[PDB]
Every structure is written in C-alpha cells, then in structure tokens.
RNA sequence: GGGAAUCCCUUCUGCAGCACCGUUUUAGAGCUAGAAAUAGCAAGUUAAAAUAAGGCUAGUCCGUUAUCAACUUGAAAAAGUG
DNA sequence: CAATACCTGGTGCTGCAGACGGGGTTCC
DNA sequence: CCAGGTATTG
C-alpha cells in the first residue's frame, strides 16, 4: 500500500504515467466525484496518459511582429514625405493627400471627388493615357527639364520611397562598372598585361549580349569561351569569366597550386580567400581578380537594367517601360494570331477569368508561371508564334511591371531616380532644394539591426539607448540614438559571462591573449622521448617559449612534423623523437597574430608586451562591432600608431564569436604565494606543467579559493522559468512541465507519500524539402557538377531517401567509382556506414547509396580498407561541397585508422541502453531536486527517490521479446502502457543489479562490457541462446526481483485493463484572429471588417475566426417581430478577437449579442476539448462552438491487439519462432471477424456514423479473399473511424471513407460536463440538463 | 557517472533589421446594335490605401510564443480541497 | 437539420548570441 | 498536413 513507484513516458504530445506496487501491479482507488450528479465516487486505475496539442515555437509570432513594425515604418516614411510636401501642395491642391487617403473608400463614403490625382475625370484620363504605368512618369520626371505638377512629383517620389528595394550592397552604385563591354575589355587588358606570351584576341567578341544574356551562368561561360579559339572554359581567363558570372572556379590548376583555390564572389570568405590565393602567386594578379570582380558587378546590374544607360538617367523605369511596350506589341500580335488561326478559343483566352489564359492572368488568380503553362501549347499549335515562344522560354513574355523577381533591384537604383527627379524639380520648387537630402535620407535610412526597436520603455524586445530624449527621425538618428551603446548592448545582452568569474565579461574568441592561452594550454601537456632519456619529459618554459617564437609565430598551423624537424632537430639536434599530447598538428593556433602581422607588418609591435592592451582593445572593437564606420570611429584613437593604409586594412578586418573565459581569469588574478597568473603558469610551471583544469583545482594555489569566492547566486527561477530557459524544443519543454505537474498530482494521490523510484523515458523526436534542395544546389554548384541540368528535381521529391542520396552523391556509387542510374534506384541499396546493429542511426548522415551493399566489404565493420583507398578522394570532394558531413566522412574513413575496435562496439551497445541526452538529464534533475530535499549528518543529500532514466529500446525490446506488442493506431493506451513498462523494467533492472545505479540513477575488458551490456536484460528470459531459474533474485541481498511464473501474468493483466485515464488537455485557443485571406465583398454576416468603418458588404474582409473558448449562456432572446422574450440555453463561441471585450465585462458583451437576463452565475467557460458524456457512455469533446470531436477510447482486448501486430507484420527472431507466430495467426484467423464486430459494436454505441460503418462493413466483406497480412494492415487503418479526437478520412484498401463530422453542439447542453484534473483521477461532473427551463 | 578548455564541426532555440509579391475596395470615361434579354467588338500590364479589429504607455512602441480542469477563498497573486 | 465539397498567405536576404551531439587532444 | 469554417445542396 505505502510503497510504490512511478513510470513516465515524456513525449511531444503526450505524458504517459503509471503507478506500480511491489509486485509491479497498478493500484486502483475510489476517488470522490464532485458536482450535481447522483454519482459520489468512482473506481480508477492508477494508470493513464495526458494528451495535448504541440507546443509552438516563437518564430511565427516573431515574423509577424517584425512585419508589423515594417508596415508601421513604411507608413511613417510616406508620412514624412507628405509632411515635407504639406504647405506647397496645399497651395497647389488643398485636398490631394485627402483624396489619396480615401482612395480605398467607395464613392458613397468618399468625402471628395473620386479621381485621386487631379479631382476630375478629364485630367485623370489624360494622365493615364500619357503615363500608363508609374514608370513612364518616373522616367519623364527624370529626363525632362520642364517644371512638373507637384502632385506627379510627389507620386513618383512616394512610389520610390514606398517600394525602395533591398540593401544587400554597401556604398554607391553606377561607379563606371555599369558597362559589361568596357569591363570585359579591361579584364582582357589586365590578363594580357600579365601574360604577354599568351594573349587573347577579343576582337569581334560581343561581350555585352553574351554575358548579359538571360541564360544559365555556365551556358554564358560556354558561349563566351566558344568565341575565343584556343581558350578552354577551365583555363585562367575562363575561370575569371566564371568568377564574374557567379560560379565557383578552382584556380588551383591555373597556378599549379597545392592548396585548393576555390573562389566564389558571393561567399563571405572571399575577401580572405583571395588574400590567401594572392599570398601564393603574388600581388601582380590582384589587379586581375579585382577587374573580374568589377565585371561581376556589371553583369549583376545588366540582369536588372535591360536598356542602354546613355539615352536616359532612369534605366530601371526604362526597362519597365520596355516590359510594357513588348507586352503591348506581343498582346496585339497574339490577339491577331488567335483571331486568324483559332477563333473559337479567343473567348476562353481573353474573357474567362476562371481559365489560366490572359483574362485569368490579368483579372483572375493566374500567375505568370501558370499563364505560361496554359499558353505554351497554344503557341506551339499555331504558326507565327516562334518569337513569342522564344520570349516564353526566356520567361520574358507579356510581363507585368510588379513581379516576384523585382527583389533583385537594389535601393541605389531607386535612389538614383529619386535624386535625379529632385535635381530636375528643385530648380522650380525651393522646398525641394532645401529638403532634397531629407527625402533622400527617407529613402536610404535603415534602423540598424544592432539598434532594434526605437522604444521608450514599453518594449520587452528593445535595448536602444538615446543620447537625448526627443523623437527619433531618419535625419536626427545619429544625434539622438547612441549607436555605440546600443550596438554594445545588442551583444552584451546575449553573451555569457565567465562562469568562474561571474562578474567578468568573456574575452573575444579571436583575442590575442585568448589564443595565447589556448596554445600554451595545449602545449604544456606535450611530452617527448628520445634515446638517452629514461622517461618522457614535459617541455620547459624556455622550450615552450622557443616553440612559440619559432613555429607558432611563423606558421598559422604547427604540425608534429614541424615540431620534430624545425625545433627538435634544428635546436635540440634530435634525429628521432616521440611526441605525445598532440596528433598530426596542434589544434590551437595564433591566427589573430598572423592576421595582424599581415595587416600592420610590425612583428616587434606584436611581440612587445606594452602594446598588449591596445591590441586587445582593437580586437575587441573588431569583434564587438560590425559597422565599418563605427569600427573606424573606435580605432581612431590609434590612428597615430599606424599608416592610413594600415588603418584602412584594419577597418576591413572583422571577427565574430566570443571565448568562454575572461581576461581576469586568463591573465588577471594571481596566485598569492607565486604572484603568477593562469597564463604565467601555462608558460612556466616547473616540471609539473599544470594546465587550466589543474591550476583552478589545486588546493596548494589561490585560484580555486578565489573562484569559489567569486561565485554569486542569482534570483532562483520558478519551475516554469527554469524549464523555459532549458535548451530544447518548446514542444518537449511543454511535455516536461506537464510531467512535473503529473508527478505532483500523483504524489498527492498517494497521501503525500513519495515514491521509491521514478522511471522516466523521453521519446526520440524527429519547407524541409526547401532546406534539402538548398543543400543540393549549393553542393552541386560548389562541386561544379551539372547533375541538376541533366536531371531536374523538385524539392518535394527529395523526401525520397534514395533519390536524395543520389543527388548528395552526385549520382555516383559511394563505394565504387562508377555512375548510378536514376531510373534504377529501386535496384540499389541504402547502407549504414557503421552497421545499425552497433549504431541505431538511420539518418542520411549514417546512410549511403550504393549499387550493392556487398561491395561495402565485410558487414561486421566499417567499409573495408580497399573501399577507402578507392573512394577517399571522391569522399573528400563530397565533404568540401558540404554534401556529406565531417562525421559521415570520418565514419566512412575509419578503417584506415583501425576501423571499429571492440571498445567502440561496447560503447555503441552501452549507448543503445544508457541515456545521455542533456534534456533528459535536466528533467531527471528537476524531479530529483523536487523529491529529495533533506541532508544527512555529513550534509550530503538524502536520496529517498531514485530518478531512473531509460531509453525507448529497453521497453521496446521487452515488448517484442515477451509479446506485449503495441499498435499505436488502436487507441492512446500505449502511452500509459509504455509508462507502466518503464516503471516495471527500471525498478526490476536496478533491483537485480544495484551497481548499475551510477549509470541509471541521477546523482553523484572491452569484450566483457560488450558481452555484459548485450546480455543485461537476459535475467528476464527463461532460456537464452544455445537456461536460467524461474525466480530471479539479487545476489547479495537475496531479495526477489522477478518471478517469471507470476510477474509476467501481472504485466499481462495490467495491459489488459480496459479502464485507462486518457485525458486530453483542455486549452484556450490563441494566435491569429481568423484566416488571413482578404475575401471580396459578399452578403454574409460571417465577413469581418478589416477596419472599423469598412463595411464588409462593400469592402470585403475576413471570415473563419478562431474560437478562443465557448461559453454556456442561459438567458432569454427576443423572438419575432414582437420581440417576445424566449428562454434559451446555447453555446456562444467567444472568438480570439472578442475575448478581451468579453472578459472585461461579460454581461455587457452578451447583452450586445442579443441575450437578455443572463444568468451570470450559470456562465460556464468551455475551452476546446471540453469533455461531455451522454447516453451509454458515449462521450464528445468540444471541437468548437458548433462542432464536436469523438470523446471515447476503443479498449480493444489484448488478444486482438497482439494478433493485429503479428498478422500485419508490424515489425523477427528464430525461424521456428516465426513459424510459431504464423501458425498462431492462421489458427486465430477468426479474430478478424471478432475485431470487426468489436469495431462495429463500438461504432454503433459511440461513433454513430451509419453510412460510414455500413460502407466499412461492405469493404471488409469485399476483401475477405485478400491475404491475411493485408487485411490486418487495413484493419489497422479502420481504427481512424473510432480514434479519439477530430474525425478524419481513411482508406480500407482502395475504398475511401470520408470523415463523418459532428456539426452540432446542441446535445451537450443537456449532457454531463466532466471537469478532469491533470491525471483525470479527480472529476467534477455537472448535469447540464438541470440548467435552463 | 558527472564536468572543463581547445579543434572539426553538426543541429536547433531566441532576437533584431530589410526586400519582393499576393489579396482586398477604389481610380484608369469602354464602344456599337438592341426597349430590354443579349450580341459583336474594343480593352487589359498601373496606382492609392490596408495588411491582424486595434491599445495606451502615444513610442518611428505594443498586438499570433509560453502558461490555463473544477471548487473554496481571494481584488488579484496564490494557497487550499478529495 | 445531412452529406458534400471546398478552403486555408507566400517568397527571398542581412546580422547576432546560445546550447546540443559527437569524433578527437588534454585535464578535474 | 490537420481540421475547423463556410456555403451549396437537399
Ligand atoms: K461622395
Ligand atoms: K574555345
Ligand atoms: K492574376
Ligand atoms: K590535432
Ligand atoms: K564583429
Ligand atoms: K599615422
Ligand atoms: K497558447
Ligand atoms: K495553436
Ligand atoms: K484538465
Ligand atoms: K566535445
Ligand atoms: Mg496598423
Ligand atoms: Mg502589390
């Protein structure tokens, strides 16, 4: 009675729970029932499962929040411009902005004339005739010298400001890198300057048309190279052109380089990458690569601007007008062609918005892509459509001006047109001259990402600090906003403090002191032996100093070969030396030292300790800030120390990331007796050579004492705060908090008696096609492969394992250097790099596509050495293209390092059994600290409750070994059953082997451990491979842990119990008010106004609102023309938008809806999934205010569940055991009819879907000659009809059963409402029939 | 067992700053023949404004995450109840 | 009222911090 | 993908 344990199964949508006794039995209690029914108590088994909707991330909320801010600020830009235009526009047209503001209104509601620009129909029609698009007006106002109407000037400037373009490019544009011809010519000039003996004849080469052509980068490269005889695309000039076109050329073979020189102008590394390449071949080639960069800028701009820039200063608007003119010409030609050749199709093409013709393209919902797909065969079917087809395949036919690709347009182009119009019209309007830079600033200004929202103490997201308390504008931003303090707070609010010194900021990752620390920390544990030496020796202080000065300060990376040859041979005169503590090359390195040595070119400055501070500060500025102007402002204090050239090169250098220790810990605090810092000991510590860990843990030093003193205790978090700050998915965090609440309630159930053990098991948890396609595109263009050209793929298709592996392997076998056939993927094998017997990893990271798995070698180990020798280079190419990860490459190449040792296999099995994920440890810590709170005489924790953590494989193997099978589709009982089995297995496992507590309980020979952990669960078995007692006891205590004659029967009876407390968490719905779609006007009271005065009957709006929670209303409503009061009882869905109004005053809200004399005390708040019971135990859940969900569980008996598992081949064993299971299936075939009858009785009692049940019965009687396996597999599908929750469709073979929905909630108003606690053991039942007259 | 620093990374959480579309109502004089029903043709590419209703704290801020059985108290926060 | 069937905001970019899981060097 | 809103049909 008093002693019990708890089993828990923590999932993303469920928390299973069970209470067990000494004999692994589940108790049952009488629980009091509250309410107004005649039932005063109820018998409950202490087993169940809480169900809840998934916890959501904050991402969608954040995207909507930032979009909201962007809409507000766009409006503010327009408002700034209008404030500038106010007075003079009032002189010209005192209602122009008023007409713009009310343009959306219907004429009935307009307070001014309905024509926006000019206020009369003649002028308006004339305007549209002269300027059919806004880009016509923009080009005119840029080119013309005449004084223009102020309203048209405003419209042009406002159109530029409202849709200003991206900010991906820093600086200014059109810096004479505009022409592709001239930059190509200059690239030829530079190349011919370096290679006089090998010049290129570029005469007659139309570089403009070739490089700006609308074709793939590689195709344009091929076109240009074809125009150059004796020049190949992978030559030097070909690689430069490929770099300008945006490809990833490898300049290695061009310059006979050893280090691969892959360059892409888009990658962040290029600025350093080039500097690396230029380090090997010299700086004579710098001019060449920079000329190629200029050419790249030219080609990128030629993508956007398709017009000659010498006829107009508005090339973008001119290109839009080109779109318009070609659209007009081609539409005229297409209309004439269709009239002549296909006159019957003309109406469908140009009049039917429902079809994807021109009518649906302009008036319907047809996109440019859909319109091209619809009209492609029509153009092919006709004659004279040759050039129209050319334009269609170029995606340049009948184009609009506002299109999806206009995202390419940089803001500098709109800025050029804006500045041009201002320059034209400031000659006539003085306020345009005085406010020119102001309007330009309105277009150009961005709030920096490091500043955040410009709040004033009412934003939990803001961090900006102001230099003065006044309104921030785009023009006073630098003066009002403290950009320095704001940018510093942006980082320091997120960065960790030193854990050893909690009040000390952490050093920058690339700090010189930090890398000195890391290098000395690694170097102090290096040992070496020679011949005459008796014992390996540490490196002395002088030796480490010499190694740093000779190797670490002359090479970016120091290898063990460099250590042996460049020091031990050159200095110590050793011909042979054995090194330990480092393999291949040192992990740490003085990278910042070499960066700054290249930049400032003063090694003595870098080595002088007096400059330490300065250098540190500099790196800090390069790490703390990312804006080059702010970096310049901060480095200005050291301008006197370096040349202007060095200062510029220093500006361009930037670092990211932070270390993990503070400067005060590394080189600040000093040991009391020695007076030496941590770094001082790392540089020299006699013959002990203590490292960081030893230094801060040595009781003979002051470091440990000072670290203990420096720790501070912050304000303790709450349970919810602690769980929220955990590192994990918000879904599993929701599960964790629910688990803790379940444990608290269970302890209260057991009379505040704490359990003996708590066994917890956390489920392994596994758009995305977009990320996969991004990976494959990047890796293939980085690879330089044409696999996407020769074989096109949709991102969705990549959800196929084998095809995704095909593209990740560039269509090649991973074990044989051969090509694979896409059409033969069904014949190929997917192989685990490390076998799944050892590592149960089914990720693409551990899988590989090969023709035959036989070719991997031996199945017991990692791929053989022969395969590695064959395929290592191909694997390295796949690695550098990110097509395979480093771990995948290392597992693939482990055979050359000995392959899998026996220790590796032992560790793999141990991993399969012992849980090591950090989040599970955090849950165990939470439970352990809540259960165990007292301390003993030695002030050590008293662990009354053992928190055991198990992995899912233990209970899964238990179920499969002792035929306690699970079928998830039958019902939700399997969560509770998993919890029960977790408790049983964990308690029994630690009872049998107490020494396992260290492995399995929270708190403080390889063949032998492999054998042991593989045979840890054999004590449950009676006979193993190739016998054991029926009673299993503990060896030392003699206590019984498992009775194989009685306890298995207990587990069976527990899993057979029909009454299981499955509780669906009732939740108030939150989030969006309704569907986002802005529907057109319609006569319906379902439409919701998008603005207070926008009557949806005239303006359209939203519908489909989400009900936050329903409310039971008992009141009277007026009836008929007489308004006679009639008593009612009904459900009112309070929408999310209505919730605040309803809660502020419920009576006023309800009376506004029409209810009179509302019984205030009878108002019942009913969230989603509110439980109601009707007749014959039939239950419903509240799906909404006008729909219900299935509220019952189908407790299918255990015999039928195990039969369904075995018959369907759900998941083997000995062939004799296989045939025993097959013979049992065939001997119990009648279980099929018995299961169908169980389902039918359940559906007639509870589901009440006459049509669906009859159709299912007909479908079952139709496929009775089908194989037993397939019939069982589809019986599994049938349980969707009876599953708890929302109805859904399901297929029995090819017969589709659509969901029967409960579109009415009238009945629950007279049924019994059931309020359940979190476990469901405590209930309050309210007979709703006793409400209302 | 647990933990630390470094290397190669890997995956995910949280935050800020932007762009392009979409949609919605209005504006872009449709014409001719019919009494009209309708028929024959012309035309189409653009813009304004909104983009959670809105809020007070009035900021170039905030408004979709997390958390929530019932009951007794409680203004609430919370505690308590089988 | 029951069956039925439709519908459902999307794309692209920049910058930053952190923990996580897992191979390796060294330690507590 | 779900699964609740909506209108159409009856
Ligand atoms: K009017
Ligand atoms: K050629
Ligand atoms: K369209
Ligand atoms: K190494
Ligand atoms: K930085
Ligand atoms: K100077
Ligand atoms: K919520
Ligand atoms: K939700
Ligand atoms: K509940
Ligand atoms: K590690
Ligand atoms: Mg707004
Ligand atoms: Mg638009």
Residue A1168 DSSP code: B
A644 alpha carbon – ligand 6 mean position (Å)? 6
- Taking the CA of residue A65 and the C1' sugar atom of nucleotide B64, their distance in angstroms comes to 9
Residue A503 DSSP code: T
Q: Rounded to an integer, what distance in angstroms lies between the CA atom of residue A1199 and that of residue A648?
A: 80
Q: How far apart are the first and last CA of chain A?
A: 48
- Taking the CA of residue A184 and the C1' sugar atom of nucleotide B44, their distance in angstroms comes to 42
Nucleotide closest in space to A450 (CA vs C1'): B16
A741 CB below 7 A from strand B atoms: yes
Q: Rounded to an integer, what distance in angstroms lies between the CA atom of residue A280 and that of residue A259?
A: 9
Q: Rounded to an integer, what distance in angstroms lies between the CA atom of residue A55 and that of residue A1065?
A: 12
Residue pair A1010/A837 in contact (Cβ under 8 Å)? The answer is: no
Cα A1150 to chain centroid, rounded = 43
- Phi, psi dihedral angles at A680 (to 5 degrees): -60, -40
Using CA atoms, how far residue A532 sits from A529, A535, A689, in Å, is 8, 9, 22
- Taking the CA of residue A27 and the C1' sugar atom of nucleotide B79, their distance in angstroms comes to 30
How many CB atoms within 10 Å of residue A617? 14
Which residues of A403-539 form beta strands (DSSP E)? 506-508, 527-529, 537-538
Which residues in A1146-1161 are b (16+ Cβ under 10 Å) and which e? beebbeeeebeebeee
Judged by DSSP in three states, A41 sits in: strand
Nucleotide closest in space to A1083 (CA vs C1'): D7
The DSSP secondary structure of A311-326, one letter per residue, reads: S-S-HHHHHHHHHHHH
**Overall residue count recorded for chain A in this entry:** 1333
Using CA atoms, how far residue A84 sits from A79, A80, A147, A485, A1075, in Å, is 9, 6, 19, 31, 38
H runs (alpha helix) in A93-179:
96-101, 121-130, 134-143, 150-162
List CB contacts of A9: < 8 A, sequence separation 6 or more.
A15, A16, A17, A49, A761, A763, A975, A976, A978, A979, A982
Q: Rounded to an integer, what distance in angstroms lies between the CA atom of residue A563 and that of residue A775?
A: 39
Angle at A1165 between CA A1162 and CA A1169, to 5 degrees: 135
Angle at A432 between CA A430 and CA A433, to 5 degrees: 65
A11 CB below 7 A from strand D atoms: no
* Residue A218 burial by Cβ neighbours in a 10 Å radius (0-12, 13-18, 19+): middle
How many CB atoms within 10 Å of residue A75? 11
The DSSP secondary structure of A159-223, one letter per residue, reads: HHHHT--B--S-S-S-SS---HHHHHHHHHHHHHHH-SSS----TT--HHHHHSSSS-HHHHHHH
* Strand B nucleotides where any atom sits below 7 Å of a protein CB: 1-29, 42-55, 57-71, 82
Tell me which residue of A1008, A989, A998, A1026 sits closest to A905, measured CA to CA: A1008
Give the H or E element holding residue A255.
helix A252-255
The DSSP secondary structure of A1259-1276, one letter per residue, reads: HHHHSTTS-HHHHHHHHH
A654 alpha carbon – ligand 5 mean position (Å)? 5
Tell me which residue of A160, A154, A162 sits closest to A96, measured CA to CA: A154
- List residues in chain A that are followed by a break over 2.5 Å (C to N): 766, 1004, 1026, 1211
* Strand D nucleotides where any atom sits below 7 Å of a protein CB: 2-7
Resolution in A: 2.5
Residue pair A1114/A1126 in contact (Cβ under 8 Å)? The answer is: no
A68 alpha carbon – ligand 11 mean position (Å)? 7
Bridge partner residues of A1172 (DSSP): A1180, A1313
H runs (alpha helix) in A46-133:
59-92, 96-101, 121-130
Residue pair A1152/A1272 in contact (Cβ under 8 Å)? The answer is: no
Q: Rounded to an integer, what distance in angstroms lies between the CA atom of residue A1097 and that of residue A1084?
A: 7
- Phi, psi dihedral angles at A432 (to 5 degrees): -70, -35
The DSSP secondary structure of A568-630, one letter per residue, reads: IITTS--S--EEES--SB-S---HHHHHHHHHH--HHHHH-GGGHHHHHHHHHHHHH---HHH
A776 alpha carbon – ligand 10 mean position (Å)? 29
Q: Rounded to an integer, what distance in angstroms lies between the CA atom of residue A552 and that of residue A587?
A: 11
Give the H or E element holding residue A1205.
helix A1198-1207
How many CB atoms within 10 Å of residue A259? 10
- Taking the CA of residue A1189 and the C1' sugar atom of nucleotide C6, their distance in angstroms comes to 21
- Phi, psi dihedral angles at A792 (to 5 degrees): -80, 145
Greatest alpha-carbon span in chain A: 117
Using CA atoms, how far residue A64 sits from A59, A730, A760, A768, in Å, is 9, 19, 37, 21
* Strand C nucleotides where any atom sits below 7 Å of a protein CB: 1-5, 7-28
List CB contacts of A1193: < 8 A, sequence separation 6 or more.
A971, A972, A973, A1060, A1062, A1284
Cα A1107 to chain centroid, rounded = 29
- Taking the CA of residue A166 and the C1' sugar atom of nucleotide C14, their distance in angstroms comes to 10
A1189 CB below 7 A from strand D atoms: yes
Which ligand is closest to the CA of A241, given by its number? 2
Q: Rounded to an integer, what distance in angstroms lies between the CA atom of residue A1060 and that of residue A273?
A: 64
Q: Rounded to an integer, what distance in angstroms lies between the CA atom of residue A221 and that of residue A1285?
A: 59
Judged by DSSP in three states, A1112 sits in: strand
List CB contacts of A1318: < 8 A, sequence separation 6 or more.
A50, A738, A741, A742, A745, A1063, A1065
A1069 alpha carbon – ligand 7 mean position (Å)? 6
Give Rg (Cα) of chain A: 38
Give the H or E element holding residue A1130.
strand A1124-1135
Give the H or E element holding residue A1291.
strand A1290-1292
**CA dihedral defined by A554, A555, A560, A564, rounded to 10 degrees?**
-30
Q: How many CA atoms lie within 13 A of A910 on its CB side?
A: 17
List CB contacts of A810: < 8 A, sequence separation 6 or more.
A780, A783, A785, A787, A878, A883
Tell me which residue of A188, A437, A165 sits closest to A305, measured CA to CA: A165
- Taking the CA of residue A761 and the C1' sugar atom of nucleotide D4, their distance in angstroms comes to 34
Q: Rounded to an integer, what distance in angstroms lies between the CA atom of residue A911 and that of residue A483?
A: 50
A229 alpha carbon – ligand 10 mean position (Å)? 55
List CB contacts of A799: < 8 A, sequence separation 6 or more.
A768, A769, A772
- Phi, psi dihedral angles at A1291 (to 5 degrees): -110, 125
Region at A882 (left for phi over 0; alpha for psi -120 to 50; beta for the rest): left
- Taking the CA of residue A9 and the C1' sugar atom of nucleotide C28, their distance in angstroms comes to 35
Tell me which residue of A20, A25, A24 sits closest to A4, measured CA to CA: A20
Using CA atoms, how far residue A892 sits from A829, A1058, A1322, in Å, is 16, 50, 56
Nucleotide closest in space to A1107 (CA vs C1'): D4
Q: Which of residues 150-209 of A touch strand B (CB under 7 A)?
A: 155, 158-159, 162-167
Q: Which of residues 1265-1294 of A touch strand D (CB under 7 A)?
A: 1285-1286, 1288
Using CA atoms, how far residue A1032 sits from A20, A852, A992, A1043, A1289, in Å, is 19, 46, 8, 6, 49
- Taking the CA of residue A35 and the C1' sugar atom of nucleotide B72, their distance in angstroms comes to 14
Please name the method used to determine this structure. Answer: X-ray
Which ligand is closest to the CA of A110, given by its number? 1
Nucleotide closest in space to A774 (CA vs C1'): C12
- Taking the CA of residue A656 and the C1' sugar atom of nucleotide C14, their distance in angstroms comes to 15
């Amino acid at each position: 009675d008093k002693k019990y344990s708890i089993g828990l199964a923590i999932g993303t949508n469920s928390v299973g729970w069970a209470v067990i006794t000494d004999e692994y039995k589940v108790p049952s209690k009488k629980f009091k029932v509250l309410g107004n029914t005649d039932r005063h108590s109820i018998k409950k088994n202490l087993i169940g499962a809480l169900l809840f909707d998934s916890g959501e991330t904050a991402e969608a909320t954040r995207l909507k929040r930032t979009a909201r801010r962007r809409y507000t600020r766009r409006k503010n830009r327009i408002c700034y411009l209008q404030e500038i235009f106010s007075n003079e526009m009032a002189k010209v047209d005192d209602s122009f902005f008023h007409r713009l503001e009310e343009s959306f209104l219907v004429e009935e509601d307009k307070k001014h004339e309905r024509h926006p620009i000019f206020g009369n129909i003649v002028d308006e029609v004339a305007y549209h005739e002269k300027y059919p698009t806004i880009y016509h007006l923009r080009k005119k106002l840029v080119d013309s010298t005449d004084k223009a109407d102020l309203r048209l000037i405003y419209l042009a400037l406002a159109h530029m400001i409202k849709f200003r373009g991206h900010f991906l490019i820093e600086g200014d544009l059109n810096p004479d890198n505009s022409d592709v011809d001239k930059l190509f010519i200059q690239l030829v000039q530079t190349y011919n300057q370096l290679f006089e003996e090998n010049p290129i004849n570029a005469s007659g080469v139309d570089a403009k048309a070739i490089l700006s052509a609308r074709l793939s980068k590689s195709r344009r490269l091929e076109n240009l190279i074809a125009q150059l005889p004796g020049e190949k695309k992978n030559g030097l000039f070909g690689n430069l052109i490929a770099l300008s076109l945006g490809l990833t050329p490898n300049f290695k073979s061009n310059f006979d380089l050893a280090e691969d020189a892959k360059l892409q102008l888009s990658k962040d590394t290029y600025d350093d990458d080039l500097d690396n390449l230029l380090a090997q071949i010299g700086d004579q080639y710098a001019d060449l690569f920079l000329a190629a960069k200029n050419l790249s800028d030219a080609i990128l701009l030629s993508d956007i601007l398709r017009v000659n820039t010498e006829i107009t200063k508005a090339p973008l608007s001119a290109s839009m007008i080109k779109r318009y003119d070609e659209h007009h010409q081609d539409l005229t030609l297409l209309k004439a062609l269709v009239r002549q050749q296909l006159p019957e199709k003309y109406k469908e093409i140009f009049f039917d918005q429902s079809k994807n013709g021109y009518a649906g393209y302009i008036d319907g919902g047809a996109s440019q892509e859909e319109f091209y797909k619809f009209i492609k065969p029509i153009l092919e079917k006709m004659d004279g459509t040759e050039e129209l087809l050319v334009k269609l395949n170029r995606e340049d036919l009948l184009r609009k001006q506002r299109t999806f690709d206009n995202g390419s347009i940089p803001h500098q182009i709109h800025l050029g047109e804006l500045h041009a119009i201002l320059r034209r019209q400031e000659d006539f309007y003085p306020f345009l001259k005085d406010n020119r830079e102001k309007i330009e600033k309105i277009l150009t200004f961005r709030i920096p990402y490091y500043v955040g929202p410009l709040a004033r103490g009412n934003s939990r997201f803001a961090w900006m600090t102001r230099k003065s308390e006044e309104t921030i504008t785009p023009w006073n931003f630098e003066e009002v906003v403290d950009k320095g303090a704001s940018a510093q707070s942006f980082i320091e609010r997120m960065t960790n403090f030193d854990k050893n010194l909690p009040n000390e900021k952490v050093l920058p990752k690339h700090s010189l002191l930090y890398e000195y620390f890391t290098v000395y920390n690694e170097l102090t544990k290096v040992k070496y032996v020679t011949e005459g030496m008796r014992k390996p020796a540490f490196l002395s202080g002088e030796q480490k100093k010499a190694i740093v000065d000779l190797l670490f300060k002359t090479n970016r990376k120091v290898t063990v070969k460099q250590l042996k040859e460049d020091y031990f041979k050159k200095i110590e005169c050793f011909d042979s030396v054995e090194i330990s503590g480092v393999e291949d090359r040192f992990n740490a390195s003085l990278g910042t030292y070499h960066d700054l040595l290249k930049i400032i070119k003063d090694k003595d400055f870098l080595d002088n300790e007096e400059n330490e501070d300065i250098l540190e500060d500099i790196v800090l500025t390069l790490t703390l800030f990312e804006d080059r102007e702010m970096i310049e402002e901060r480095l200005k204090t050291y301008a006197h120390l370096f040349d202007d050239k060095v200062m510029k090169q220093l500006k361009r250098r930037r670092y990211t990331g932070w270390g993990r220790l503070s400067r005060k810990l590394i080189n600040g605090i000093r040991d009391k007796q020695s007076g030496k810092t941590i770094l001082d000991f790392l540089k020299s510590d006699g013959f002990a050579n203590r490292n960081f860990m030893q230094l801060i843990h040595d009781d003979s030093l002051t470091f440990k004492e000072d670290i203990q003193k420096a720790q501070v205790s912050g304000q303790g978090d709450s349970l919810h705060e602690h769980i929220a700050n955990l590192a994990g998915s918000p879904a599993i965090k929701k599960g964790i908090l629910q688990t803790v609440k379940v444990v608290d309630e269970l302890v209260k159930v057991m009379g505040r008696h704490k359990p003996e053990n708590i066994v917890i098991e956390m489920a392994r948890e596994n758009k995305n096609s977009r990320e996969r396609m991004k990976r494959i595109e990047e890796g293939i263009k980085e690879l330089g492969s044409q696999i996407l050209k020769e074989h096109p793929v949709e991102n969705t298709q990549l959800q196929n394992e084998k095809l995704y592996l095909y593209y990740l392997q560039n269509g090649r076998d991973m074990y044989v250097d051969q090509e694979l056939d896409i059409n033969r993927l069904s014949d190929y094998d997917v192989d685990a790099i490390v076998p799944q017997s050892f590592l149960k990893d089914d990720s693409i990271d551990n899988k590989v596509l090969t023709r035959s798995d036989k070719n991997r070698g031996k199945s017991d180990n990692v791929p053989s050495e022969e395969v590695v020798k064959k395929m290592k280079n191909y694997w390295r190419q796949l690695l550098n293209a990110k097509l395979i990860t480093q771990r995948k490459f290392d597992n693939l190449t482990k055979a050359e390092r000995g392959g899998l040792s026996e220790l590796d296999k032992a560790g793999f099995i141990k991993r399969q059994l012992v849980e090591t994920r950090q989040i599970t440890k955090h849950v165990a810590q939470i439970l352990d600290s809540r259960m165990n709170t007292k301390y003993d005489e030695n002030d050590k924790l008293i662990r009354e409750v053992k928190v055991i953590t198990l992995k899912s494989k233990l209970v899964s193997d238990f179920r499969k070994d002792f035929q306690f099978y699970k079928v998830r589709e039958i019902n939700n009982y399997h969560h509770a059953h998993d919890a029960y089995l977790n408790a049983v297995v964990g308690t029994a496992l630690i009872k049998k082997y107490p020494k396992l507590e260290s492995e399995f309980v929270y708190g403080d020979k390889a063949t032998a451990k492999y054998f042991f952990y593989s045979n840890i669960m054999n004590f449950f078995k009676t006979e193993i491979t190739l016998k054991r007692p029926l009673i299993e006891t503990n060896g030392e205590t003699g206590e019984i842990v498992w009775d194989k004659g009685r306890d298995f029967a207990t587990v069976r009876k527990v899993l057979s119990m029909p009454q299981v407390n499955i509780v669906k968490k009732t939740e108030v719905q939150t989030g969006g008010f309704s569907k986002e779609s802005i529907l057109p006007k319609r006569n319906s009271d379902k439409l919701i106004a998008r603005k207070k005065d926008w009557d949806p009957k005239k303006y359209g709006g939203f519908d489909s609102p989400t009900v936050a929670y329903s409310v039971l209303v008992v009141a009277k409503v007026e009836k008929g023309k007489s308004k006679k009061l009639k008593s009612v009882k009904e459900l009112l869905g309070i929408t999310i938008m209505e919730r605040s109004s309803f809660e502020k005053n419920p009576i006023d809200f309800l009376e506004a809806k029409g209810y009179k004399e509302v019984k205030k005390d009878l108002i019942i708040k009913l969230p989603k999934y509110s439980l109601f019971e009707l007749e014959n135990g039939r239950k419903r859940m509240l799906a909404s205010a006008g729909e219900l969900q299935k509220g019952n569980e189908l407790a299918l008996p255990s015999k039928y569940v195990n039969f369904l598992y075995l018959a369907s081949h759900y998941e083997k064993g000995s062939p004799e055991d296989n045939e025993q299971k097959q013979l049992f299936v065939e001997q119990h075939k009648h279980y099929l009819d018995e299961i169908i009858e169980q389902i039918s009785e359940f559906s007639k009692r509870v589901i009440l879907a006459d049509a669906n049940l009859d159709k299912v019965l007909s479908a079952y009687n139709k496929h009775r000659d089908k194989p037993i396996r397939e019939q069982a597999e589809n019986i599994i599908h049938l349980f969707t009809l009876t599953n708890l929750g929302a109805p859904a469709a399901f297929k029995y073979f090819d017969t589709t059963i659509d969901r029967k929905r409960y579109t009415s909630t009238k009945e629950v108003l007279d049924a019994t409402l059931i309020h359940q606690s979190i476990t469901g053991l405590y209930e309050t039942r309210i007979d709703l029939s006793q409400l209302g007259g």
